[PDB]
A paper describes a structure:
The overall topology of MZ0003 reveals the presence of three large inserts, referred to as regions 1, 2 and 3, which do not have counterparts in either of the fungal homologs. Region 2 is a 45 residue loop between β5 and β6 which includes three 310 helices and a short (6 residue) α-helix (α6). Together, regions 1 and 2 form a subdomain at the N-terminal end of the central β-sheet, with the helices of region 2 on the same side as the catalytic residues and the loops of region 2 protruding over the active site and partially occluding it. In addition to narrowing the access to the active site, region 2 includes several basic residues, namely Arg 137, Asn 139, Lys 140 and 141, Arg 160, which contribute to the positively charged surface potential surrounding the catalytic pocket. The relatively occluded access to the catalytic residues, suggests that MZ0003 may act on smaller or fragmented substrates rather than the intact LCC polymers that are the proposed target of the fungal enzymes. The geometric arrangement in the active site indicates that Asp 332 is the third residue of the triad in MZ0003, functioning to adjust the basic character of His 343. This was confirmed as the Asp332Ala mutant of MZ0003 is inactive in assays with both p-nitrophenyl acetate (p-NP acetate) and methyl 4-O-methyl-D-glucopyranuronate (data not shown). Electron density found in the active site, is consistent with a molecule of glycerol and interacts with the catalytic Ser 243 OD (2.78 Å), the side chain of Glu 281 (bidentate interactions O2 – OE1 of 2.42 Å and O3 – OE2 of 2.56 Å) and Lys 247 (2.70 Å). None of the six cysteine residues of MZ0003, which are all found in the conserved core regions of the protein, are involved in disulphide bonds in the crystal structure. The loop/helix region consisting of residues 187–206 extends from one monomer forming a “hook” which is embedded in the second molecule of the MZ0003 dimer.
Numbering used by the authors: 4 to 103, 106 to 402
C-alpha cells in the first residue's frame, strides 16, 4: 500500500546529473550546455514524457483585438490558435489579461475546466471541447456552459497579478487533448500509431502534448508587441504542473518555470516511492506518460533519470517548486529533495542554486534561483500561492 511515513521511505541512489551516461565527469558549464543537457532531455523523452513529433507546425492566429476589462484595470485579448488551415483544425483558445507603459511580463498556464472558469467576465468564450464533471466547482455536464463562469477564479488571481504589473494568460488543457476520465482505445488510433517515425513506446505524452500547447502559446506571444515574450513565467497545478515543469524545462524561451503541487512524475523524486508511485500514476492515467514509462512500474530504482534531472534542465533560468503541507500524495519533501538535487548543476552554471539545506518550514519562500515554498493547507492554487509566485517573479523577472 501507499506510504505517508517519512521513516519508511526506502534508501536509494540518484543518477548524477553531472556524470555523462558513458561515465565521464561533467566538469564545466560548456560540457553541460554542449553535451549533457541534451542527453538528459533525450532520456526524459525516451523513458518518461515522449518526444514531440518532427515536421512543421502551421499555427494560425485570430485578430488579437484588445478590449477594456475589469473596468478597466485591464485589457483582455482572446486569440484562437489553430493548427493548420483545414476543418477542424485542432484549435485552442488563449485568454489574456494585461495591465492597461512597457512590454508586459506574463504568467501563462493551462486551466482545468475552461477559460470561462478563471474569471466571471461574461465575454470569455465558452469552450466547445469536452469538460470533466467536478463536484467542488458544481460542474455536472461534459459540455461547458455559462453557469460555471468564474468558479475557478481563486486559482487565477488576475486582479492581484494585474495590480503588481503582470499579465495572466491561459488555455484550457482539453482544447489540446481532453484527458478523458474513461478509457478509449479505438481502432483507428491503434493503427495510426504504427505508421510512425518515432516508435509507439517513445511517442508523446498527454503531459508532453499539453506542454507543446504551452510552447505554441509562446509562439503567439512572440508576435504580440504588448507582451514581453522574454519575461514569460510558465506555471501549472497538479497534472498541469507536471506539464509546466516539462514545458519550462525543454522550451528555453520561458524566463521562469513554476510547478505547483505537481507531485509524482513532476517535481517529486520517483525513488522515494512516497504517496503516489509510478505504477499507480500509470495505472490511473495510462496516456499521461510515454508507454516506455510503464515498464518502470515498481522499478523506480532502474529509471535512467529522476526528477532532480528535470529541474536541472531548467538551468540557468529560475524555477520555483511550490508544495502544499497536506498534499502527502504529492510527496512535498520529495519535491524539495528533487529541487536540492539540481543545486550542483545550477552552481556549475554560475547561479545561487537552492539556498536551503533542510526542508524549510511552511510559508516562507526560499527565493534563490532554484526556489522552494511549502504552503500550509490543501493541494490547490490559492491567493497565498500567487503572492509567492509574484514574490519570486519580482526577484528574478
Amino acid at each position: 500500500g501507499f506510504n505517508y511515513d517519512e521513516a519508511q521511505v526506502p534508501k536509494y541512489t540518484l543518477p548524477d546529473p553531472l556524470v555523462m551516461v558513458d561515465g565521464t565527469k561533467v566538469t564545466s558549464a560548456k560540457q553541460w550546455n554542449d553535451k549533457r543537457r541534451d542527453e538528459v532531455q533525450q532520456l526524459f523523452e525516451a523513458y518518461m514524457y515522449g518526444k514531440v513529433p518532427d515536421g512543421e507546425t502551421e499555427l494560425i492566429f485570430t485578430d488579437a483585438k484588445g478590449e477594456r476589462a475589469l473596468g478597466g484595470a485591464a485589457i483582455r485579448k482572446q486569440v484562437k490558435i489553430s493548427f493548420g488551415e483545414k476543418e477542424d483544425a485542432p484549435a485552442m483558445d488563449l485568454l489574456i489579461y494585461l495591465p492597461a507603459k512597457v512590454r508586459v511580463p506574463v504568467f501563462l498556464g493551462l486551466n482545468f475546466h475552461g477559460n470561462h472558469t478563471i474569471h466571471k467576465d461574461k465575454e470569455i468564450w465558452l469552450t466547445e471541447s469536452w469538460v470533466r464533471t467536478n463536484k467542488k466547482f458544481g460542474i455536472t455536464k461534459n459540455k461547458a456552459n455559462e453557469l460555471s463562469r468564474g468558479v475557478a477564479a481563486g486559482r487565477w488571481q488576475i486582479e492581484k497579478a494585474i495590480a503588481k504589473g503582470y499579465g495572466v494568460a491561459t488555455i484550457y488543457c482539453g482544447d489540446i487533448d481532453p484527458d478523458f476520465n474513461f478509457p478509449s482505445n479505438g481502432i483507428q488510433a491503434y493503427y495510426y500509431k504504427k505508421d510512425q517515425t518515432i516508435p509507439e513506446k517513445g511517442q508523446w505524452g498527454t503531459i508532453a502534448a499539453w506542454a507543446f500547447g504551452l510552447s505554441c502559446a509562446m509562439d503567439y506571444f512572440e508576435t504580440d508587441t504588448d507582451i514581453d515574450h522574454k519575461k514569460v513565467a510558465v506555471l501549472g497545478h497538479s497534472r498541469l504542473g507536471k506539464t509546466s515543469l516539462w514545458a519550462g524545462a525543454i522550451d528555453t524561451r520561458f524566463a521562469l518555470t513554476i510547478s505547483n503541487c505537481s507531485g509524482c512524475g513532476g517535481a517529486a523524486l520517483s525513488r522515494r516511492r512516497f504517496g503516489e508511485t509510478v505504477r499507480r500514476i500509470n495505472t490511473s492515467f495510462p496516456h499521461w506518460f510515454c508507454s516506455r514509462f510503464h515498464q518502470y512500474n515498481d522499478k523506480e530504482d532502474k529509471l535512467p533519470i529522476d526528477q532532480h534531472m528535470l529541474i536541472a534542465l531548467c538551468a540557468p533560468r529560475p524555477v520555483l517548486i511550490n508544495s502544499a503541507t497536506e498534499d502527502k500524495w504529492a510527496d512535498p519533501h520529495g519535491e524539495f529533495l528533487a529541487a536540492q538535487g539540481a543545486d550542483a548543476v545550477y552552481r556549475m552554471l554560475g547561479t545561487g542554486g537552492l539556498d536551503a539545506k533542510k526542508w524549510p518550514e511552511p510559508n516562507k519562500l526560499v527565493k534563490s534561483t532554484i526556489g522552494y515554498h511549502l504552503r500550509p493547507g490543501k493541494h490547490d492554487v490559492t491567493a497565498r500561492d500567487w503572492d509567492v509566485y509574484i514574490e519570486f517573479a519580482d526577484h528574478h523577472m
